Design a protein around this ligand. Sequence first.
Ligand code: S6B
Ligand code: S6B
Ligand code: CA
Ligand code: CA
Ligand code: CA
Ligand code: CA
Ligand code: CA
Ligand code: CA
Ligand code: CA
Ligand code: CA
Ligand code: CL
Ligand code: CL
Lengths: 234, 234, 9, 9
Amino acid sequence: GAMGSMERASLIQKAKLAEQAERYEDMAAFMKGAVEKGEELSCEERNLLSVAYKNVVGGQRAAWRVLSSIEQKSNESEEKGPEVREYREKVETELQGVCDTVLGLLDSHLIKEAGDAESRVFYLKMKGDYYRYLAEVATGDDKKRIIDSARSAYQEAMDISKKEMPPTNPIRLGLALNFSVFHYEIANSPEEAISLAKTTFDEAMADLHTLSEDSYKDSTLIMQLLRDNLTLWT
Amino acid sequence: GAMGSMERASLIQKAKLAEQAERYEDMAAFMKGAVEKGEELSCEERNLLSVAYKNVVGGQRAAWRVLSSIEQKSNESEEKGPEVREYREKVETELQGVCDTVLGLLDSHLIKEAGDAESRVFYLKMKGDYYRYLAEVATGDDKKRIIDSARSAYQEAMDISKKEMPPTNPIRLGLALNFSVFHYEIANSPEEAISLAKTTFDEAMADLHTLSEDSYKDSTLIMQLLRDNLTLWT
Amino acid sequence: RRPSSWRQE
Amino acid sequence: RRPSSWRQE
Ligand SMILES: *Cc1ccc(-n2ccnc2)c(Cl)c1
Ligand SMILES: *Cc1ccc(-n2ccnc2)c(Cl)c1
Ligand SMILES: [Ca+2]
Ligand SMILES: [Ca+2]
Ligand SMILES: [Ca+2]
Ligand SMILES: [Ca+2]
Ligand SMILES: [Ca+2]
Ligand SMILES: [Ca+2]
Ligand SMILES: [Ca+2]
Ligand SMILES: [Ca+2]
Ligand SMILES: [Cl-]
Ligand SMILES: [Cl-]
């Protein structure tokens, strides 16, 4: 499968080199190859998979937003022909393909083999995120279903995280941050977004006293993102 | 040729949209399609071609330098196996392919149809630049010939620029800047680099009085790059 | 105006 | 340490 002939450990090593070189497309292709070896991923390997695809899809989303804004201004205007729409559609189809690829890795077979809370929550958060990126560009018959798929993945991850992880766990925090962004941006539920961000921040605050200095730094960095959104939204 | 079915004007329009979206790979593919329509390029179109490929190859060169540095440190060290070399070679072969593509557009048939000094100097400068990027990674039997090909293209462009353009012309300035970098970095001729940068700066200084405010701004910006190199080198 | 989702330090 | 070649404003 392009990477089928490369050793798992060599794909992991090359994904780390690609990260250092800021070659995120290559990094994602190496990590897809590693997942397709069929073994579960370690904590560090899950992080490499997520960093790779978030950077690839992040560049696509930024480009889609530039193009979408030009297309909307063109629809306010001298008719420039079909090119702005065509090129926005090109970038959109590419973005959808990357999201479908990640969702396919999660469904075949990362989630079903993930039994520990840390891995299962991590993958379900990714599933919510990539359906959220699909929802950002969705306009047709399936838009509500894409939004519900994001909601359902985030909700399952939240339910496990609240039962199995402390309120300062960084994955639990990042999940709550992203589900709160889903509520605000995608589900048109700003009050739910604000409530979730506040409750997550406050419950983490109350558990910081249990942490080492390094864990404190990890948790407080994500708490600051929650507070930055609360400042933006209130 | 992937872009063979798209109108020339639509490829140009999409290259401008890709620039705004920072999608430089797409921008270069659109501009390759436009060149392959067979017509000469206007000033603005030459700029789009150069911006597109310089950004694509610039990302490749930055990644190659990160990887080359890791490989050299590995050769000082615990043996990590072939992966760092293999991945540096992958990025290098990609970079070579992009340089070969640009050189191929210049040879088929942009340079031979370019009769005005501004177009011919622009294309010969590009030819020198992309052989220079080949020389940065070259190690084998053809390395001297790659360096000579860069030198020869830059020299022809210099000869035309000195006969046909004022000493403040931005293309003449950028050409001299890049040939001076060639001398310093590639040809091991730092004194030639310093002399060329100084003479170019001084002759431009003396011709600024002829310029409008906007042309003055264009020329002085490039003169500052010459002065930045002189400060680094002396 | 766009909010922060999780990102690397 | 690397010098400046031509680049956009
Ligand atoms: C989504 C998410 C949230 C938090 C982390 N993390 C782990 C350790 N520090 C931060 C990751 Cl990797 C991903
Ligand atoms: C290589 C080079 C040098 C100068 C310019 N330029 C034109 C107008 N301002 C700067 C370009 Cl586009 C390319
Ligand atoms: Ca094996
Ligand atoms: Ca579409
Ligand atoms: Ca398992
Ligand atoms: Ca636990
Ligand atoms: Ca036509
Ligand atoms: Ca090679
Ligand atoms: Ca001609
Ligand atoms: Ca002239
Ligand atoms: Cl298109
Ligand atoms: Cl490789």
